[PDB]
Amino acid sequence: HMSTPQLMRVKKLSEFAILPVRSSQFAAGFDLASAYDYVVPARGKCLVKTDLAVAVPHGYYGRVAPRSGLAVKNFIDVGAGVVDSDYRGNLGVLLFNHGDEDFKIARGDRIAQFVIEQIALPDIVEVDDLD
Amino acid sequence: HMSTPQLMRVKKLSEFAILPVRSSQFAAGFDLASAYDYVVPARGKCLVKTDLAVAVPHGYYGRVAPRSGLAVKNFIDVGAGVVDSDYRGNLGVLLFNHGDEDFKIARGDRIAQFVIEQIALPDIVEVDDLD
Amino acid sequence: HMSTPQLMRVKKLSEFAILPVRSSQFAAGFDLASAYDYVVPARGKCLVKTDLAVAVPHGYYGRVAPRSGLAVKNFIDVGAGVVDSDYRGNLGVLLFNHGDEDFKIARGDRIAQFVIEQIALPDIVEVDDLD
Numbered sequence: 387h388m389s390t391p392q393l394m395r396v397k398k399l400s401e402f403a404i405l406p407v408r409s410s411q412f413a414a415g416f417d418l419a420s421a422y423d424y425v426v427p428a429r430g431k432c433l434v435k436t437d438l439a440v441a442v443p444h445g446y447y448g449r450v451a452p453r454s455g456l457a458v459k460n461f462i463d464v465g466a467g468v469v470d471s472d473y474r475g476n477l478g479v480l481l482f483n484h485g486d487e488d489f490k491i492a493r494g495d496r497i498a499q500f501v502i503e504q505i506a507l508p509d510i511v512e513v514d515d516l517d
Numbered sequence: 518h519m520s521t522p523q524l525m526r527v528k529k530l531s532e533f534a535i536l537p538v539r540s541s542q543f544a545a546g547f548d549l550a551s552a553y554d555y556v557v558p559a560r561g562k563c564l565v566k567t568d569l570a571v572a573v574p575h576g577y578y579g580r581v582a583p584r585s586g587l588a589v590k591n592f593i594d595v596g597a598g599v600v601d602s603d604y605r606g607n608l609g610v611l612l613f614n615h616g617d618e619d620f621k622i623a624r625g626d627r628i629a630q631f632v633i634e635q636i637a638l639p640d641i642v643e644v645d646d647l648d
Numbered sequence: 649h650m651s652t653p654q655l656m657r658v659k660k661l662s663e664f665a666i667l668p669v670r671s672s673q674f675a676a677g678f679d680l681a682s683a684y685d686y687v688v689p690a691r692g693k694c695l696v697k698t699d700l701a702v703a704v705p706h707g708y709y710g711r712v713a714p715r716s717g718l719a720v721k722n723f724i725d726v727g728a729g730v731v732d733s734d735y736r737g738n739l740g741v742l743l744f745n746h747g748d749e750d751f752k753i754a755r756g757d758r759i760a761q762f763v764i765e766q767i768a769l770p771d772i773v774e775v776d777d778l779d
Binding site: 387389391393394395396397398408410411412439440441446453458461463484501502 | 634641
């Protein structure tokens with residue numbers, strides 16, 4: 387039983403996790419929410435747990451990506467964010483706060499989105515002449 | 518009449534908009550240009566209007582992505598940038614300026630690119646055992 | 649002889665280059681390593697050469713993307729990073745260091761990853777009514 391492009395398997399690692407949910411039929415990403423309380427310090431960073439484990443389908447990876455509103459209004463950006471299809475740890479959201487005020491996060495706050503990006507997985511061939 | 522992977526529909530919201538254009542046959546992104554005058558403050562941010570509305574084809578999303586030259590030389594990065602295929606508002610470019618000098622933008626300046634990224638849109642199934 | 653989704657052609661531009669390598673079967677990205685010595689200044693940026701030229705397959709682009717560990721622990725992020733499938737120059741990694749200590753890089757250090765993202769390449773049709 388593996389994840390497919392139509393069906394992605396997810397496990398809650400605690401009672402505090404909130405399942406990913408897509409805000410509309412063609413929204414690029416699932417909403418991700420914080421499982422705990424955090425602060426993203428001004429000019430600083432914070433790794434936020436979702437307490438989810440996800441199985442992104444093979445042929446894809448999961449990109450943790452920014453919510454537009456928090457970026458435009460609160461100077462929040464997403465670092466790291468490449469979730470491999472065999473990654474089975476706690477799905478974390480690395481937030482950068484480029485503003486001059488701390489950004490407060492309570493459990494349940496939506497703080498990123500999660501896009502299932504289609505990729506190739508080529509092998510490498512070293513050549514002496516590219517073209 | 519919907520957008521397809523071969524044909525993306527775009528509407529100018531004012532006389533000041535410039536249509537997206539691909540710099541070469543296999544360039545990843547369309548050039549996006551500012552419709553107005555702006556400054557990206559040093560260590561700061563600015564949302565730049567293109568005055569375009571776009572209909573990204575279903576099965577994809579539009580990623581506003583950085584121009585390499587402005588990033589390497591002028592410390593410009595792109596925040597936010599996940600454009601859903603049902604988004605019909607003004608296509609904005611959120612710029613972060615991590616440098617110590619302001620970054621000036623005049624109408625017509627190319628300030629981002631726009632990549633049509635292929636994605637899956639899976640549903641979620643919560644399980645007790647991922648693998 | 650062109651690159652395909654199964655086989656990506658790469659050329660070493662010097663003896664100091666290290667070939668991209670995928671850490672596991674389904675890892676999203678190839679590891680990229682520095683060919684020279686660098687420092688990413690605190691609150692600053694640095695363009696790092698790999699001394700590789702790559703031929704990303706048509707229908708895709710290469711995204712230089714962050715390594716999770718350096719982002720979470722050392723506040724390192726990747727700027728620029730859209731490698732077009734016809735780009736034949738030295739594959740550079742633009743690093744931003746948002747921390748307050750310099751980030752030292754020696755030849756051979758792994759400092760980014762390289763994801764082959766699948767894209768559409770639509771033409772533009774300007775319309776008066778999107779939907």
